[PDB]
Design a protein around this ligand. Sequence first.
Ligand SMILES: NC(=O)c1ccc[n+]([C@@H]2O[C@H](COP(=O)([O-])OP(=O)(O)OC[C@H]3O[C@@H](n4cnc5c(N)ncnc54)[C@H](OP(=O)(O)O)[C@@H]3O)[C@@H](O)[C@H]2O)c1
Ligand SMILES: Cc1cccc(Nc2ccccc2C(=O)O)c1C
Length: 310
Amino acid sequence: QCVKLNDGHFMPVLGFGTYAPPEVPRSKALEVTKLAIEAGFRHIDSAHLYNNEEQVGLAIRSKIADGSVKREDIFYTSKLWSTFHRPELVRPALENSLKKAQLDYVDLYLIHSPMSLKPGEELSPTIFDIVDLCTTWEAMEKCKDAGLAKSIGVSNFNRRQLEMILNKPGLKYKPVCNQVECHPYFNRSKLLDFCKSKDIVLVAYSALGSQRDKRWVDPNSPVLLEDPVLCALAKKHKRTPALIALRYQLQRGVVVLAKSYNEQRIRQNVQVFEFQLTAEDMKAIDGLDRNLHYFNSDSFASHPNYPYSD
Ligand SMILES: NC(=O)c1ccc[n+]([C@@H]2O[C@H](COP(=O)([O-])OP(=O)(O)OC[C@H]3O[C@@H](n4cnc5c(N)ncnc54)[C@H](OP(=O)(O)O)[C@@H]3O)[C@@H](O)[C@H]2O)c1
Ligand SMILES: Cc1cccc(Nc2ccccc2C(=O)O)c1C
């Protein structure tokens, strides 16, 4: 239940999303990540941005300590925040994430976003920065060579941003993945074909339609999990709309994340491996595509490097 990455490492095809908004107590992250591992998740997705790396790292170390899993059975991802794009800041930012989680290495480190922000400890300084992401990428390469990250990749990059890295003079390591918003309303078919042509894995976030956080998501936007085609497919397969949306991705060759802080829904989500969709089903889902990205905020849209500009 793994995909082989372009550097020889393996990535579990279903990942646990760990972001929760700051009104959720930090202690929840520890509890739900343990539940995710007990359920059968082996891919755990975190980031400096999420302010949960201590808890998530502790959940992983607990499950190693109690004997359920070994470190090498867990694929752990963190991400370089956008205030740390300057090359000399990359490795220290990774080392801080590692110290927070109390781990020797991350399976995957990503550039969280191509939209550089003014350097500082403040996450949302209130202001943009201009940085050659090719130099950021060089510093990511050195973190791989150092054994700080097994694999390195990008997140929120469009085709052109991804091409910039791929065409870089003296490239040593291709991004193994690009983790992007991806679900039946914004299925990224063209970007997905581009990544397949390069042996780069596309990892889908907001695959269940996002947490609909009012800071970036319009509450008027359609609720993906109430979609009538999804609901009709869930009735046909006697599963749930969430399960259909996750299975859709696996059948497209997409690595899919699923966040849930709910005990029942965490266990429910690993049922994605227990059924499959037919071609007529996949076509019905493909027909939902309507260029809708839930994250739709002035914070992003006015950035010189906004990925949805193309
Ligand atoms: N690279 C980036 O910039 C980026 C951006 C967004 C997300 N991500 C990563 O991707 C992860 C997932 O994306 P996301 O946070 O946008 O959320 P998501 O996976 O789209 O989930 C949205 C909501 O779906 C609900 N849910 C989960 N399972 C369900 C089920 N079986 N039935 C009904 N509802 C279900 C969850 O609510 P409950 O908790 O109540 O179950 C969750 O809040 C994030 O946690 C983060 O790790 C990365
Ligand atoms: C478009 C963009 C740019 C930088 C970071 C993110 N990611 C997040 C933004 C707010 C809250 C959570 C996340 C996430 O990474 O889960 C996105 C969606």
